[PDB]
Automatic annotation (TrEMBL), chain C:
Stated name of the protein: NADH-ubiquinone oxidoreductase chain 1
Pfam families for this protein: NADHdh (PF00146)
Subcellular locations according to the entry: Cell membrane; Membrane
Gene Ontology MF annotations: NADH dehydrogenase (ubiquinone) activity
Origin superkingdom: Eukaryota
PROSITE patterns named among the record's database cross-references: COMPLEX1_ND1_1, COMPLEX1_ND1_2
Catalytic activity, reaction form: a ubiquinone + NADH + 5 H(+)(in) = a ubiquinol + NAD(+) + 4 H(+)(out)
GO CC annotations, alphabetized: plasma membrane
Length: 147, 157, 311, 58, 92, 165, 65
């Protein structure tokens, strides 16, 4: 239903990305791919990650790609691990056990991530910081022509 | 005609009311009549109070005030600016220079009236016209707009 | 469940009416500031002027500039209208008067604000005028450079609350409003919202409904940023801090009053100051607001952690 | 005294804000009978579900 | 928990409908390198604010360790920003 | 310089203290009487020397004052006046054609101050915008109608500047 | 038209009002047109035109005589 169409549109958008004549249309379908992926993540309950995908992918990287394409040239160009469950849910839906012990104090996807991103796995956080610093330094040295 | 004579009349009245209440002229300042236009839109006379607000581009203006001496070198630009405004458009000639050449009528480099380049709807006389004279000219243009019957004529053809 | 479109209409149509009357209010307040009167002939006090303007721009017999793909050009105003209105689904007006109560509302607002850059860019390229393209590029860069500072100020506010729910940020100000302690943060947020909307000293800049949609989207953004300013720092719908006898006034009135105050500040600031230059916009936004926002984040977090005043 | 004529459109904006706020408080209440609750967690969602089932039962 | 996004989707659909109605209303009757540097800086600081998002909310659980981890992260990006500053990439 | 001066000028840089001083002025002008006038109802002040629409005057006996001397036509810097004259049946020197180009007129008042009989004057009227170009080609009949319509005000004004001209 | 004195009435029915000013003036000589059909923007006779534009201090009833 909602998953099928939201995946089909993303596949069509990606196919148009890899097979686009005008790179501007490629950038637009590139944006649409992540627009659909954000909804797909929303279907999983990862509200934070979908919003970040909107913020990062089509807020920073897509804008940067658009800047590069526009102002520059606009030139031309299964059964082994997890066997699927067959649609037998008339009785399975009734067999749903809910444990209220895990619902009395429920964490959001945001605070669940932030509980261990900064204390128990902080070295990887600082390595990503170093990668960002490398990107900052390398952007200038490659592209810089003053006066 | 039991209701056409009534409904068409009312819808045409609505059209005329909108057009008279919101006029967006394009001031074509060329000479000392530009000072009078600026004085008209200032605090004393408040051309804004009637809904008139000036516009920089011809894409968004439905009126065009030619106020200043039109020279031979400037007439092509005048016509080009006029040709860029949308269809329900009017031209107001302000001052003697725009009307018939004025004090430079017998010059070798002056167009003897902006009506030789664009069709003029209202002529405002003066040199320079008083700001209240320009108010009277805009009011006369409003009165002329209220005479339009666009929907009735469209119905009758 | 068929009443959700009723709620969406009830939040969208009054928004458009308020945008039109906000344009009228701006043209009236500037006239009053400069010792004149705004539009007064059309209505009893000019209240009918926006309707006349709307019928004028509707009845113009305009032509479509089909000297382009005609798709991106026609949809860029539609896209910016999308983004401008979609952010109003989370802003609460009173206790339980929100259309969508997200638990990630602050981040959703940040995403919506960051996605508003595409409409102006697409409009700039689709117009064959290279100069309009460059102007749109400059405006996009400005919006980006100040959206960074807006996000940092959002972090400053979020530290003291502990949740991204907008309706809980207001309830967190029951003791005192966040505009009192973080007054420099409030000033910086207001200035950044001025620069984000391409307005005030930060406002460096075709026909019929495309330009109409761009205009409506920009003014809806102005209203939304005034709402955010009163939502994060002025206590939202909460009453005045002291003298609790006027509690008969509904909470939705206080939100409206504070929003009108901030809109008056927009009009006041634009009327009172000249324009900045582009070489000064970027320098200011990258050298005066980013360091200050980062320093305020650091200071607030350090002070709250030190005394264990965290949420 | 003289400045109130510029407060008319500005008060119309406030009325529009109030009507946007109050439309959802009397439309959502109309088909639910309860004002919208802020801060929905999975406990609240499941417990409203249990409410619906128990009301349907009796 | 995520039932509150369906109103947003219906809002998007109805906003699309009203925008199309508005469009149909009148139908019835060189290169500069600094534009790349600004985008690069925006990308870096957008990622920084993204990393602030979990830290601010969960600052009550973590205490004096997550705070200093975030401080080291900020120090590294501040050294990067200072390099951006003195190199003239912030000027126009 | 002084630490006190550095602190004082650094605070003013950060607290925007020279912009609050402009906001206060604009706000103080917000609550003030307006100086705009309702143009259709109230008009702006003028002077008895005002140079507006032209008018040809006549004697109280009903005889036109113009004696066809063409002294106004020779002084007109814009050449906006054309006069044709001949001997009338009574033998009096009168004009047959007296027309003024209002599109050439510069409203300088030279004709008014050159007339030896006070026949041509510029009345107080300034609201005569027309919808057609040749309605601005005033002739003798139009000018005489203007003189008859504005006779009392023109007479009062000419009485006022009798002490100056 | 409140706290104002009616100077005189015109042959067309127009009413002329006057208010006293002290230092800044404003709304001290205006007309209430007897018509409302767009009022033609020019209906003031010659005897009242001078009084309205502050050319002469005579009302216009006195200008007739
Ligand atoms: C810069 O020049 C320009 C202006 O002058 C400043 C404008 O005013 C404007 C636009 C001014 C306007 C009044 C257009 C706005 C019109 C609308 C928002 C139409 C809204 C109509 C509705 C929502 C339907 C009415 C709904 C109800 C009555 C329900 C009540 C609840 C533009 C576009 C412009 O380019
Ligand atoms: C109830 C509602 C109250 C009102 C709410 C709204 C408040 C705003 C009202 C309007 C205020 C005026 C708005 C004018 C808009 C344009 C102003 C921009 C001017 C500007 O950016 O100033 C810059 C510096 O000042 C700045 O940096 C300005 C930002 C300063 C923020 C304050 C930081 C103070 C920190 C003190 C902390 C102490 C307390 C905590 C211990 C540039 O100036 P420049 O040209 O000199 O360039 C600096 C080179 N060096
Ligand atoms: S009509 Fe007179 S004031 Fe106007 S532009 Fe010509 S010379 Fe100048
Ligand atoms: S006012 Fe001057 S330009 Fe006009 S007709 Fe008299 S002399 Fe000629
Ligand atoms: S109007 Fe005066 S100056 Fe002109 S021809 Fe007649 S008498 Fe002579």
């Amino acid at each position: 239903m909602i998953l099928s169409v939201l995946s089909s549109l993303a596949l069509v958008s990606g196919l148009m990305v890899v097979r686009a004549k005008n790179p501007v249309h490629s950038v637009l379908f590139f944006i649409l791919v992540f627009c659909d992926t954000s909804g797909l993540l929303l279907l999983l309950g990862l509200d934070f990650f979908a919003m970040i995908f909107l913020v990062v992918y089509i807020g920073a990287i897509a804008v940067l790609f658009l800047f590069v394409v526009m102002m520059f040239h606009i030139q031309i160009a299964l059964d082994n691990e997890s066997i699927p469950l067959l649609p037998t849910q008339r009785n399975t839906t009734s067999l749903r056990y809910t444990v209220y012990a895990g619902k009395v104090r429920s964490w959001t996807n945001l605070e669940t991530l932030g509980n261990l991103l900064y204390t128990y796995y902080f070295v990887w956080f600082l390595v990503s910081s170093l990668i960002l610093l490398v990107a900052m330094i390398g952007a200038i040295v490659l592209t810089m022509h003053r006066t | 005609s039991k209701a056409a004579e009534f409904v068409i009349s009312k819808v045409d009245d609505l059209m005329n009311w909108a057009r008279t209440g919101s006029i967006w002229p394009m001031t074509f300042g060329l000479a000392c009549c530009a000072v009078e236009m600026m004085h008209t839109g200032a605090a004393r006379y408040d051309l804004d109070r009637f809904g008139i607000i000036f516009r920089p581009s011809p894409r968004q203006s439905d009126c065009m005030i030619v106020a200043g001496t039109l020279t031979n070198k400037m007439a092509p630009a005048l016509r080009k600016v006029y040709d860029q405004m949308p269809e329900p458009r009017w031209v107001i000639s302000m001052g003697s220079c725009a009307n018939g050449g004025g004090y430079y009528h017998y010059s070798y480099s002056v167009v003897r009236g902006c009506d030789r380049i664009v069709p003029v709807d209202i002529y405002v006389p003066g040199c320079p016209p008083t700001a209240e004279a320009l108010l009277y000219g805009l009011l006369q243009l409003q009165k002329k707009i209220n005479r339009r019957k666009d929907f009735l004529h469209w119905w009758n053809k | 469940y068929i009443a959700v479109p009723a709620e969406i209409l009830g939040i969208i149509l009054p928004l458009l009416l308020g945008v039109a009357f906000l344009v009228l209010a701006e043209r009236k307040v500037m006239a009053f500031v400069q010792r004149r009167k705004g539009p007064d002939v059309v209505g009893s006090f000019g209240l009918l002027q926006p309707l006349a303007d709307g019928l004028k721009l509707i009845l113009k017999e305009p032509i479509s500039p089909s000297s382009a793909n005609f798709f991106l050009f026609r949809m860029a105003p539609v896209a910016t209208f999308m983004l401008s209105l979609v952010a109003w689904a989370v802003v609460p007006f009173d206790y339980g008067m929100v259309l969508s109560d997200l638990n990630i509302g602050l981040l959703y607002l940040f995403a919506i604000s960051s996605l508003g850059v595409y409409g102006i860019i697409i409009a700039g390229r689709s117009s064959n005028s290279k100069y309009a393209f460059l102007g749109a590029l400059r405006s996009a860069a400005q919006m980006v450079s100040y959206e960074v500072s807006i996000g940092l100020i959002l972090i400053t506010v979020l530290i003291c609350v502990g949740s991204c729910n907008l309706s809980e940020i207001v309830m967190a100000q029951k003791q005192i409003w966040f505009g009192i302690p973080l007054f420099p943060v409030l000033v910086m947020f207001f200035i950044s919202c001025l620069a984000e909307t391409n307005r005030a000293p930060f406002d460096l800049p075709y026909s019929s409904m495309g330009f109409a949609l761009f205009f409506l989207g920009e003014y809806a953004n102005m209203i939304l940023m005034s709402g955010l300013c009163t939502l994060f720092f002025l206590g939202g719908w909460l009453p005045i801090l002291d003298l609790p006898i006027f509690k008969k006034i509904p909470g939705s009135i206080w939100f409206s009053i504070k929003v009108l105050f901030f809109l008056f500040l927009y009009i006041w600031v634009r009327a009172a100051f000249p324009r900045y230059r582009y070489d000064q916009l970027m320098g200011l936004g990258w050298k005066v607001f980013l360091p200050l926002s980062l320093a305020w984040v650091v200071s607030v977090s350090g002070l709250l952690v030190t005394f264990q005043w965290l949420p | 005294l003289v400045w109130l004529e510029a407060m008319l459109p500005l008060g119309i904006i406030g009325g529009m804000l109030c009507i946007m706020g109050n439309s959802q408080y009397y439309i959502h209440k109309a088909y639910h009978g309860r004002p919208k609750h802020i801060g929905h967690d999975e406990w609240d969602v499941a417990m409203e579900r249990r409410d619906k089932k128990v009301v349907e039962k009796a | 928990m995520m039932l509150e996004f369906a109103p947003i989707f219906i809002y998007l659909v109805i906003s699309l409908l009203v925008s199309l109605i508005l469009l149909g209303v009148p139908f019835l009757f060189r290169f500069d390198i600094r534009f790349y540097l600004v985008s690069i800086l925006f990308l870096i600081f957008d990622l920084e604010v993204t990393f602030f998002f979990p830290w601010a909310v969960s600052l009550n659980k973590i205490d004096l360790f997550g705070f200093w981890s975030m401080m080291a992260f900020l120090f590294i990006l501040t050294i990067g920003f200072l390099y951006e500053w003195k190199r003239g990439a912030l000027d126009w | 310089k002084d630490w006190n001066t550095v602190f004082e000028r650094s605070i003013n840089t950060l607290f925007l203290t020279e912009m609050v001083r402009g906001l206060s002025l604009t706000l103080k002008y917000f609550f003030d009487p307006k100086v705009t006038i309702n143009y259709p109802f109230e008009k702006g002040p003028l002077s008895p020397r005002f140079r507006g629409e032209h008018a040809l005057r006549r004697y109280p006996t009903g005889e036109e004052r113009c004696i066809a001397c063409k002294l106004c036509e020779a002084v007109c810097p814009a050449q906006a006046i054309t006069i044709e004259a001949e001997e009338r049946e009574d033998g009096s020197r009168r004009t047959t054609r007296y027309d003024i180009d209002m599109t050439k007129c510069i409203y300088c008042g030279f004709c008014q101050e050159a007339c030896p009989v006070d026949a041509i004057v510029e009345g107080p009227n300034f609201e005569f915008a027309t919808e057609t170009h040749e309605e601005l080609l005033y002739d003798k009949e139009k000018l005489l109608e203007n003189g008859d319509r504005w006779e009392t005000e023109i007479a009062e004004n000419l009485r006022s500047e009798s002490l100056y001209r | 038209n409140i706290g104002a004195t009616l100077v005189g009435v015109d042959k067309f029915g127009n009413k002329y009002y006057q208010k006293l000013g002290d230092t800044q003036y404003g709304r001290h000589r205006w007309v209430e047109y007897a018509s409302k059909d767009r009022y033609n923007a020019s209906q003031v006779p010659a005897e009242w035109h001078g009084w309205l534009h502050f050319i002469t201090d005579h009302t216009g009833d006195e200008l007739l005589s």
